[PDB]
Amino acid sequence: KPAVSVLTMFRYAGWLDRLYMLVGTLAAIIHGVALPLMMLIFGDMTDSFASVGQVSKQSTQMSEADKRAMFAKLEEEMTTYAYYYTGIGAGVLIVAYIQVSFWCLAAGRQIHKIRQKFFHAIMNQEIGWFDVHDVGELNTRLTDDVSKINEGIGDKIGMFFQAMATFFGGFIIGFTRGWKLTLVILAISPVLGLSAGIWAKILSSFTDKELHAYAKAGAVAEEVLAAIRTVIAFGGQKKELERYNNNLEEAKRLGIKKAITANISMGAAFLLIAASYALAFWYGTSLVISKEYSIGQVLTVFFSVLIGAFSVGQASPNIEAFANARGAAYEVFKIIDNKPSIDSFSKSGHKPDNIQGNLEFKNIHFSYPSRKEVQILKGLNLKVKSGQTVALVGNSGCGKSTTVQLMQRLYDPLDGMVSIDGQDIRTINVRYLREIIGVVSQEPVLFATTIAENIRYGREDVTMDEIEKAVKEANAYDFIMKLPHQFDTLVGERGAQLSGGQKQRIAIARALVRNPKILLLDEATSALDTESEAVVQAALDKAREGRTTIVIAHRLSTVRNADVIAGFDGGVIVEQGNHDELMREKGIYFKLVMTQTPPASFWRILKLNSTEWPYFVVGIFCAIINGGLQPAFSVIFSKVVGVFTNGGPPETQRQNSNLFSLLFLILGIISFITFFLQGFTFGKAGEILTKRLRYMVFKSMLRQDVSWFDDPKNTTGALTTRLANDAAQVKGATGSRLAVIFQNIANLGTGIIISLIYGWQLTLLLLAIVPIIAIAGVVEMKMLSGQALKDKKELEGSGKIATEAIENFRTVVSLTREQKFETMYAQSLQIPYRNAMKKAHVFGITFSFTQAMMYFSYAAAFRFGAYLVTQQLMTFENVLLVFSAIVFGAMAVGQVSSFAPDYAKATVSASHIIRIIEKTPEIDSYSTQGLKPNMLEGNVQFSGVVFNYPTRPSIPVLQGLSLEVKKGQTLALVGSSGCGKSTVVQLLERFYDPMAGSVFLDGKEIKQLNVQWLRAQLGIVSQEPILFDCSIAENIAYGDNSRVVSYEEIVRAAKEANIHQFIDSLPDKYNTRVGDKGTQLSGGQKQRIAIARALVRQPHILLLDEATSALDTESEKVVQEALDKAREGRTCIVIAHRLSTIQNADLIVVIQNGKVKEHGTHQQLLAQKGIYFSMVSVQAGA
Ligand SMILES: Brc1ccc(Oc2c(Br)cc(Br)cc2Br)c(Br)c1
Ligand SMILES: Brc1ccc(Oc2c(Br)cc(Br)cc2Br)c(Br)c1
């Protein structure tokens, strides 16, 4: 919404840039004007053949006499025109170069200037400006918004004035040479803009319906795949498939209805567009029989108008490129024009010599850019004597750290003044101020150069002698020399990561070359290992005594030798003096001392599509007819102008022109009829395989075992996404692109035959010319992409050192040296600049070449069409035909290169979708094999079970686990932590077979037992019961599948679960909807319902996995009261974390490290004193 003044945007265009644009826009206008003139001459050549075409047939008497005056007219005329076109092509060769070259030159020259000014502006902003902005958005604003500016002031402007030239020069020749047809062509324009407006309304309203249609099926998939362990537990795998299959049926019917309506839309749209033209051209014919126009002029205005009319559309993208470049230039120029109060690039203020370093802060009130929300300094008074070293202590607020900020004049105070020597800090140069202040901060930062270079960021003029003394004077010399490459080592975020106390000494050496008169030491010893701290601390003490120093730290070790110590309380200075004095004061300082002491030929995807042997053959056959039908319009056009250039006697003409225009419209309606079919047929054929794919995939997905859904690679969202995309992508490959790619190869095929068999070696010429300009148009775009990738590679090297500069900013400004990064970024940009110069000559040559090879190609089209062909006995009417036939058949093949990614994007989406069906599990619920025992009673026999989870085969959970529980008993299961408690329930449910050992139920190993039958006698109840969106009676009836459960039977379960209080309390009762879609209710209810569906099954084994986990107060007492009634009549395994409710259990088992450690009845384990009695004691007390 915000934008820029048009002149301010080119403020950096001066002298030549202003000329380049003027000459560029000039030749651009010349380039545009060139095309409608090309059409104007195409009318005069018709007139030439038309006068001879009328007189040659008018003879029917003399033959040799027509070999004289006729050919003489032709050779003076045709050579005059051919001489004229050859000139036009040389014109576009020059102006198209001038057009694109100059604008890309002015763009490159300016964008170089933008970048430099704009990075200069970034480094010039005071710190308070950064505290309110994100540096990351800023740097991306650097590389992206400048790119958008380049796109707008580039060669697009030349294309714009080229297009307006075609537009203006279009209707000028349109109006002057024939004003009537223009108004007639504009009259059908609202119809063409109204038919394409029905597309913006149909597409935008139906693309939502499908995204709503599958969102009903994709919602089924998401509550299933999220609750997958519950559907697997109760074996609703046939229902949840069925229940997704039923939503796929509706998505199919809505998909065929969309295929019917959308194909009715296209066909009617084209048939209105084509009829609109043909009426404007038939009524072109009505004006030649009346002698208001020449047969040549009708063409001249008809093309020049339609050329200029479509030239409007070909200019619209360049407008939006200019405006976006303006809007992008706003926030950029806003940074360049913005002037600071502090600078640091300013050459102003005093530069005191013989600085002695007496510092005082007077009544400083300050607040960071958070402003009125917080005020961190409520007045202040502090002097530090020259040579002395003052230490600042504080409990919190870190108002300590603020004084180092103000002493650098990173910000100015709200009220008060900071004074170095006698002068206010605001009178001294900002740069000289920071050159007389050395700074060592908590986190040290080192730039990605050599050690000597990071030290060289202290001062630019320095010799390895002074680097050596500096590092040796910060005892950092002994420790780099051992490191290889000597001073020539590397540092940075990337490469040679060092010890913290080692990085700080390089920072101390960096600040030491600064020979500062003032020293600021903020938190430097803090957050550092204890032993290297003393190594650094020796350097800090060796860095002082030549300087006045303010130091801030939480290490009270460094503070004793400070000449004065100062404590803060709420930004107010409270205590000051020597260490001993503050201790006698017994205040804040004393109080803090005591405290601290694979693309491949996949045919099988088409073999599954072979479910419909018809529906394709209908579309293909119907597409090829549409293909062969489409040049016949060019054949009609060729003979509407043909017979009427070849007229002779004029009485018969008016009667035929009505006949062709009729045929045309019969040929368009038979084109409508065939194009509805080829769309509907593929549409239906695509939507039905969409179901089969999503059915078989969702079937095969319910076939894998829990081992697969635990994979971090496969989550519920990633599976629904994999489910939707892959099915839609393969639909597109077999859908429109294939009907179109066969319609078009039939288009060119039925066109090339007509052209080849009519014109001899005429067609053989055009088949030498057209492929070359097509290839030359491709190699242009390859070179285009190559230059694009290359410039991206070498401007990111600049933006990379810009990245380093700006997100490490507060350090660089503390060291000054902005002019360093300033110069480095300039040297970095100098390569893309001198590269951007070559870009202009390259784009100009290529574009001018492809334009010239289009104009020269058509000079050869007529000079060969006449002369050697028309001095013979071949006819203009065919040359017209071969043009439209070949040229349209070629531009119809241009759709093949556009639908190419729809094939690859589908094959890749196919690549996964064939794998996902064929993958078979270790434990398949679908296998009908298994024992299905007859005897009812249930044991559980864990024996030597070692188990590790397939996702994390690192820490074992179960290793040598052995349990046995009789029928009708409760097996209490206590654990130190982890799923060692829970893995038992997962292995009995056979979510996994154990690594070693075995688990048995009735004496039979479950591993050889039937998988589905096994789970059918299991009453699993988890800690968070997931309930699908449906009737609570149906969430309950979900406990027994393969059979519909009686109402009184699901009532019996709700009676058991003690949930029947709601189930009548609701207005709907058992038919109320739950799942946080129809109704919401708390967890105690959800849980009871899960108990209800558990015991609908009438299991022989309950499995209670921390059922009271998320629950509170009386809700626990009632759910436990339901669980305690559910057991005592069944085999039970309970791992609930309430050991008070576990006292009345028949056997308690303690799990240690996957081994069973300690077991027995409650009082038995309570008589023993160990883990279980440590467990019961810790909760009962707490
Ligand atoms: Br009559 C008549 C026939 C074709 C005309 O131009 C074409 C041409 Br040439 C090809 C196709 Br496909 C559709 C149309 Br409309 C015109 Br304008 C008038
Ligand atoms: Br786009 C384009 C369309 C026709 C052009 O010249 C003609 C013209 Br004018 C008439 C016929 Br028939 C074929 C061609 Br090719 C040119 Br040059 C460019």
Residue numbers in the entry: 30 to 626, 689 to 1273
Question: What is the paper's account of this structure, in its own sentences?
Answer:
P-glycoprotein (Pgp), a member of the ATP-binding cassette (ABC) superfamily, is one of the most promiscuous drug transporters in nature and is capable of binding and expelling a very large number of substrates from the cell. The structures highlight a high concentration of aromatic residues in the transmembrane α-helices that form the DBP, many of which are directly engaged in contacts with ligands. The binding mode of the environmental pollutant BDE-100 in the DBP of Pgp was also previously captured by XRC and it was shown to be a potent inhibitor of verapamil-stimulated ATPase activity of the transporter.
Two mutants, Y303A and Y306A, showed strong BDE-100 occupancy at the original site (site 1), but also revealed a novel site 2 located on the opposing pseudo-symmetric half of the drug-binding pocket (DBP). To our surprise, two mutants, Y303A and Y306A, preserved BDE-100 binding to the original site (site 1) but also allowed strong binding to a second distal site in the DBP (site 2). The pattern of anomalous density for eight crystals of the Y303A mutant and five crystals of the Y306A mutant clearly shows a slightly different binding pose of BDE-100 in their respective sites 2 (not shown), yet Tyr303 and Tyr306 are involved in site 1 formation and are as far from site 2 as any site 1 residue. Furthermore, we detected no significant differences in the binding pose of BDE-100 in site 1 between the Y303A, Y306A, C952A or F979A mutants.
